[PDB]
Amino acid sequence: PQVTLWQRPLVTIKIGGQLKEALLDTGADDTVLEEMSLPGRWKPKMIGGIGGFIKVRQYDQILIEICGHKAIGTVLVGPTPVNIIGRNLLTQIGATLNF
Amino acid sequence: PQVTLWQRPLVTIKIGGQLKEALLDTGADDTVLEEMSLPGRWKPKMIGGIGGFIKVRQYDQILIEICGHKAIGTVLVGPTPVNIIGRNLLTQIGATLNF
Numbered sequence: 161p162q163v164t165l166w167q168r169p170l171v172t173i174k175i176g177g178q179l180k181e182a183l184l185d186t187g188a189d190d191t192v193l194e195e196m197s198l199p200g201r202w203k204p205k206m207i208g209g210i211g212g213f214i215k216v217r218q219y220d221q222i223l224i225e226i227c228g229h230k231a232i233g234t235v236l237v238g239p240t241p242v243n244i245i246g247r248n249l250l251t252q253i254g255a256t257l258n259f
Numbered sequence: 260p261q262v263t264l265w266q267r268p269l270v271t272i273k274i275g276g277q278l279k280e281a282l283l284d285t286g287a288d289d290t291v292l293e294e295m296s297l298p299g300r301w302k303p304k305m306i307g308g309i310g311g312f313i314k315v316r317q318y319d320q321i322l323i324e325i326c327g328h329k330a331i332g333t334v335l336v337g338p339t340p341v342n343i344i345g346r347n348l349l350t351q352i353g354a355t356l357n358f
């Protein structure tokens with residue numbers, strides 16, 4: 161069900177039993193969520209954007225339920241200001257940009 | 260056209276005589292471009308991203324041909340690693356995000 165970009169395209173995730181809103185972010189390669197715990201273990205990666213570089217912890221094989229679509233992928237948790245869903249998951253729910 | 264996000268949603272833009280390519284980014288609110296000689300007056304501004312903030316020159320009333328369509332808007336020109344088309348413009352072309 162489609163979304164116009166007049167608002168920030170936020171939807172709700174369920175990750176790891178928790179419910180958060182998240183930004184659908186077609187310009188991000190990866191998904192980076194704020195700090196919260198997630199079962200499993202991780203290694204560091206380092207990501208950047210405008211502003212520079214944060215250090216995040218990466219977990220693979222994480223289920224996320226977006227709306228009521230389930231996806232499995234990497235998530236990176238770290239000090240992002242905003243929870244972001246990026247192309248790696250965006251591709252799994254089949255999200256297109258139409259114009 | 261439709262973009263699938265399996266690759267970067269990169270698009271061709273002409274701004275102010277100059278051809279560049281830029282990322283269609285639904286996460287971003289405003290459009291921010293690498294340093295470019297656009298005609299003249301600006302306000303000084305800062306934007307927030309991941310990593311920190313950057314400091315940009317806010318030019319308004321910039322006309323851009325985006326893909327092959329056009330819009331007038333504010334662009335922020337400053338030291339971004341990648342050029343971002345953001346929703347302030349994406350709405351003017353009527354880009355929808357879609358699942």
Ligand SMILES: O=C(Nc1nccs1)c1cccc(CN2C(=O)N(CC3CC3)[C@H](Cc3ccccc3)[C@H](O)[C@@H](O)[C@H]2Cc2ccccc2)c1
Nearest residue numbers: 185187188209210242284286287288289306307308309343
């Ligand atoms: O308007 C903006 N800000 C304002 N502040 C005050 C008033 S308006 C704004 C404009 C352009 C970029 C950004 C920051 N931004 C980003 O840095 N990223 C890194 C990706 C890894 C997460 C991607 C773009 C990108 C991609 C590759 C390389 C560099 C940048 C992502 O796609 C993009 O949406 C956002 C993610 C984001 C959005 C909003 C808040 C925080 C973060 C913000």
